[PDB]
RNA sequence: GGCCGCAAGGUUAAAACUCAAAUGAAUUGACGGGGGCCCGCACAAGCGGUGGAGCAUGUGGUUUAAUUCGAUGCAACGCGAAGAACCUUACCUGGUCUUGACAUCCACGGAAGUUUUCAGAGAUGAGAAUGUGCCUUCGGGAACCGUGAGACAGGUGCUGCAUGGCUGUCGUCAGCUCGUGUUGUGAAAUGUUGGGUUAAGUCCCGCAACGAGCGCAACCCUUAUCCUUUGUUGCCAGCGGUCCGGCCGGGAACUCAAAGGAGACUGCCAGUGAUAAACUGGAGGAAGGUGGGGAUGACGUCAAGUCAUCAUGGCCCUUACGACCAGGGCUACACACGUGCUACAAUGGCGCAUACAAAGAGAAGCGACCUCGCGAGAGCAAGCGGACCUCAUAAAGUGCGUCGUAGUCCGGAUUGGAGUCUGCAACUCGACUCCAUGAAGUCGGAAUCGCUAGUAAUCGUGGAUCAGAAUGCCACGGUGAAUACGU
């Protein structure tokens, strides 16, 4: 992956957790039932003034080594191919080929 | 196969009855693993053959089978580059197979309204020489007759 | 057709982990990033100590370093202040306290990894690779292997068209679950492109 | 195991997690101070119910 | 040209020009509509499908501002993608920057919370608050922010016909080779061929061969039968309380959980065979001759696939082929092909009520009980980092009714109205719920595919990717066949 996507990401894990809270608070004073009927109008004005890469739903998961955005595993943080090198030479404590 | 020797499968009896012949029946009426259906279908048609008849059900399903086994059949050979029917002797496993296979093939044809009706009419018209059944025998033993040149 | 990994289908069976540690869902993956960048800055801090293994320990809330070398000497240096280095060093890259031992390789000629990398390091400098690898076969079976096997591949010599060669002596059963093989590889630069090398060592069963 | 399209040609592998239970009934304060005061192998996990 | 012949022709017999070879005998392979022997769902004996309909999804073509790049006979076409509304994104249109969005160096000044105006946003400007730690011998500036200049950074740009690494295939086929000796002027041969046997270059015997290596088999995982250790969160024959329920006191027997062990070796018996290797049958046994299923891929072949995972020789671009932003496209639509789902119905459709599983996942997560709504859902709130709590109610089945062969009480494409939830945001382009509508289609031409047993066929259940988005992929159990004369 070339060098400014892995950036892109950097930046927008900072946002979003810079912007944490205010986001909580705008959602619920929106979803909760029997508020002013006019509150709700300004935090939904109000919510979308925000920088867009706050939102969490905006980030991909990559490859910690190289980059990948494609065949990512959630418990390893790495991509297919990086992680049958690493199981081969013995780097993922209690690992091994399967059979039964 | 080429260098096998095949073995025989155990076949649990009828529960009603004690026969194997009526438990290789309701497996070749049998469709999808459903073999609960299969067994009701046949008793409720044994049970409406056996009021016209008078006589057992088994009795009255030899009687049946006896009219549709076969005796001769052809094989089909190339050797000359022309294809022969060469007559050959049944065994009578096969000839017990090919007889059940006919008479429920005739029978799912039939425009009666249930496949225990149907299932009973096809037997009643085997037992008085009549159907679908006894019209593929015929035509098995006539093939046979006019190739007996081959043998 | 293509071979499975020596080392990878004896694990559990003969051959040991390079890393002991258990963890959770929300470590697994913070353990194994740490585990690359301490095992990288090692890697290019003694790139001329003559290094073959590195094991990583995680007991309690801290960290334990097992070097395997050939030349400790080097490694540790007058009283200890390289070593000091290095822990302070890894201390920072993990997080937590940090601890270092050093253990030795008698025999440095039946160990893969050592060998291969001697061979690349010949490679870079103009020798002829059949000479390279002749020596290595030789060394290992008067030290007394059981069997050995190097592989190389290439633009061998500069020539345009690429090609293999290799070499055997003794035994090498890699279908056999108990043997005891060791294996490991390594890379050389050069001006026509990047040369490959495999190496094979064969002990005994067990 | 491919870099590229090869649909099948496939690996797969496992992990075990082993688990064990150990029940004190009458305990003292040596004990206790006994039990907490002690260190095991570096690839296991104890967790102490009181 | 001469001689001979009735003719057909015979006999004697040149040159110009052109090529760098033409030829004989033997050797290793490949091929044969040559011969001999042996194997495999290769035929034969059977069971169910694709090719016709509607819908899902990939490809060719055509269109477009763009419809991003790669894979192509078997061995590309539900393939890289294990999940394109923004992001992802590599493409198009317009607006912007030039030591730079991402690093190391030099030196001119100081950091991080809030909040107002103009922009589609990038990015411009005005304002309020703050004075960090720390040998300050004053030089610390490390931690992290602005600008300036130049060595430099940056490239999913080209060549898989320059490469490393990884993978497909012949093929889980039984083969592929070397040292010393001997034979031939030599290329080479023998060993590795021969008589039997085997799943097997597996084994025995013979023989100018004697030995060894990589492959075959065995050692690794799982499944089927026993016994000795420990018994909570798992278990109740015997005993005794009762609000009926493993609920309670208890018990260590059984089911089960997971560590050490036992067991299968042609070991025993008869017959055949070369005084063999092996073969056909029998006993006991949970299991018999490789008991069933996995992992495991020889020397090599196809300049096979991948410079877009990554790394890398050689070229090429640096106020642009490198950054940043909003909107659109990858979802187009006269057409052709591959892979699938749902059907065309009484072995069935609909209503009521009632048995029997296995294997998994879960803290920005799994969400019980109760209340509200026809429903998708909403509100309030226990428990669980889990043999304890939750997802979570198996379905086909069985019993009692109705429909009575009709394009139907079969099928459920399209299309109108009204809503719910995720998410800054569902127009292009999400999934789901209610009312209404009710298309093709009555078993599919020439071709053509899978399967030898707990298999095919049929029925449900779980996971990875993941805010949301499976008819695909990877796993789990229930019911349960037909046939193999033979080459």
Redo the contacts between chains.
Sequence with gaps: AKQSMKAREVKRVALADKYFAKRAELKAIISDVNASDEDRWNAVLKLQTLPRDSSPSRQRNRC??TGRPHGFL?????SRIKVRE????????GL??ASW | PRRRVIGQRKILPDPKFGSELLAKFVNILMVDGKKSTAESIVYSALETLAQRSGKSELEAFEVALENVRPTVEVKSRRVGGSTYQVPVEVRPVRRNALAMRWIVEAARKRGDKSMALRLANELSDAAENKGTAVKKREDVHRMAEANKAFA | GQKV?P???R??IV????????AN?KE???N??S??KVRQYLTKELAKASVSRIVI????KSI?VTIHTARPGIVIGKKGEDVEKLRKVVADIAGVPAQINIAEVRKPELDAKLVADSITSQLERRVMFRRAMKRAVQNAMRLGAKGIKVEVSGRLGGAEIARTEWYREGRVPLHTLRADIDYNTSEAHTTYGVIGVKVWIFKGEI | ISPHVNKDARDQYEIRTHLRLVDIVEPTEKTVDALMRL?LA????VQISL
């Design positions: 910690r080594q959630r418990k390893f943080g790495l690493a199981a081969m030479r013995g780097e993922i404590p091994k080929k | 990994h080392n990878g289908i694990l559990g051959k040991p982990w390079n890393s002991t540690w258990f869902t697994f993956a913070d194994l990033d585990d690359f320990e995680r007991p309690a334990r | 260190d570096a690839g296991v996990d």
